[PDB]
């Protein structure tokens, strides 16, 4: 009934830039949260962002702080993660997750995507 | 206390259904259990009501 | 710039304020009505420094 | 002009239709002569008075 | 009956509205206490017409 | 100050943004209308009363929503009669006096 | 009082309309509007059984 879109990673040289893009179709939304987790090779998920239709109560992991940024389109119903500065362990891999975040019970991430990678090193993937 | 819990980002679902999590650190509960087992995530959605 | 000294002491004074400062809440016009405003006003016969 | 006995008018002079919601400028309106073609009902939101 | 109408819960979760204030966060407290505060009114309405 | 509430929080007055004039708002014509008719049995014929509206602006109005060729046949009479009751139209006045 | 219950929220986001439909979706401003409906509804029964 639904299906999550991802597009837009590869290989860059530390310090360069990218920018991942994920498309959402089969929500009736409301409360749509749409966002990114990060897959280390040897470890689980992890937070990398987050962020609501319209909401704007954002989230970015600890470390993570500064480099990465959020935008979203509702129109085209689609998000997009801007990469900047590109430190070595953000080799990994990225799936965008939806669902909803609600004030008062919680959040669940309902559906998740194909994913896509992306490789921060000297020579390239 | 079940702020560290919800405080924590470690987790892809954290959803309460009759008690909003902030508040669960204010309540006394009377019996309280834990069932615990792995799905799939396409298949978290099914554990909820209806 | 300076900070001169020249600084004394001397204990508060208070007077009454009477049935001052009410100012026009809002700018829509009222002709011979009575209207009742919840905003922050000072209160009648209040302490006032000085 | 109305054919009124004395204490009749007194009884239409003493229940003034003034300070009673819309209705005193209504009849303020039937009393008038000098301001002429005055459609003084269409009053409120959908309130009128037969 | 008027008092015994404070038991019924009119939809919510809690006639009591200290408890429907400590579990639920203030977005989801006021759509419960908007079913109360509906529900009263009604009872109380039907009260003063009788 | 910009507009005027009157009593009961309704908005009455307006200074023009750009001449600082002072405009009335007043809203414009409303009002039920009632049909008059002797009955089915009787006849067809039927007369309509806009009750608190004045007859100089029925007939502006006539391609109203309501007023189909049909309704503009009933509202183009001839017959138009101002009374303190509205505009009544289909309906002859007549200077002689019977019972209500 | 009437006419006055036009100016309350009803627990609406904003008592006019055309704010409502002039800063939300119709499926949102749906439901803000079936509670000014709900509202004013009940204060013309009010107004029509006293």
């Known amino acids: 009934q639904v299906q999550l879109v991802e597009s837009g990673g590869g290989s860059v040289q530390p310090g360069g830039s990218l920018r991942l893009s994920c498309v959402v179709s089969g929500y009736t939304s409301s409360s749509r949260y749409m966002g990114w987790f990060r897959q280390v090779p040897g470890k689980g998920l992890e937070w990398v962002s987050g962020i609501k239709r319209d909401g704007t109560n954002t989230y970015y992991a600890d470390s993570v702080k500064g480099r990465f940024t959020i935008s979203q389109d509702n129109a085209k119903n689609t998000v997009y993660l801007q990469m900047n500065s590109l430190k070595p362990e953000d080799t990994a891999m990225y799936y965008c997750?939806?669902?909803?975040?609600?004030?008062?019970?919680?959040?669940?991430?309902?559906?998740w995507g194909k994913g896509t990678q992306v490789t921060v090193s000297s020579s390239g993937q | 206390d079940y702020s560290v819990l919800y405080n924590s980002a470690s987790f892809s679902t954290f959803k309460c259904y009759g008690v909003s999590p902030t508040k669960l650190n204010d309540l006394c509960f009377t019996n309280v259990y834990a069932d615990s087992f792995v799905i799939r995530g396409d298949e978290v959605r099914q554990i909820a009501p209806g | 710039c300076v900070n001169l000294t020249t600084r004394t002491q001397l204990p508060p004074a208070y007077t009454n304020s009477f049935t001052r400062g009410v100012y026009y809440p809002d700018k829509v016009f009222r002709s011979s009505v009575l209207h009742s405003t919840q905003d922050l006003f000072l209160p009648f016969f209040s302490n006032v420094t000085w | 002009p109305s054919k009124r006995s004395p204490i009749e008018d007194l009884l239409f002079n003493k229940v003034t239709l003034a300070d009673a919601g819309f209705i005193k400028q209504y009849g303020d309106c039937l009393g008038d002569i000098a301001a002429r073609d005055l459609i003084c009902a269409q009053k409120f939101n959908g309130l009128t008075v037969l | 009956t008027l008092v015994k109408q404070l038991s019924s819960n009119f939809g919510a979760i809690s006639s009591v509205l200290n408890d429907i204030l400590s579990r639920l966060d203030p977005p989801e407290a006021e759509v419960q206490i908007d079913r109360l505060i509906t529900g009263r009114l009604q009872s109380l309405q039907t009260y003063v017409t009788q | 100050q910009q507009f005027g509430r009157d009593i009961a929080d309704t908005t009455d007055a307006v200074r023009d943004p750009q001449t600082l004039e002072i405009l009335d708002i007043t809203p414009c014509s409303f009002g039920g209308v009632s049909v008059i008719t002797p009955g089915t049995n009787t006849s067809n014929q039927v007369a309509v009363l806009y009750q608190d509206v004045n007859c100089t602006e029925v007939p502006v109005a006539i391609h109203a929503d309501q007023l189909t060729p049909t309704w503009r046949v009933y509202s183009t009479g001839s017959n138009v009669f101002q009374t303190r009751a509205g505009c009544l139209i289909g309906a002859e006045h007549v200077n002689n006096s019977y019972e209500c | 009082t009437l006419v006055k219950q036009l100016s309350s929220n009803f627990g609406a986001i904003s008592s006019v309309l055309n704010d409502i439909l002039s800063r939300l979706d119709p499926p949102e401003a749906e439901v803000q509007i079936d509670r000014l409906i709900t509202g004013r509804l009940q204060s013309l029964q009010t107004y029509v059984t006293q």
């Open positions: 997750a939806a669902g909803s975040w609600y004030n008062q019970w919680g959040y669940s991430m309902d559906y």
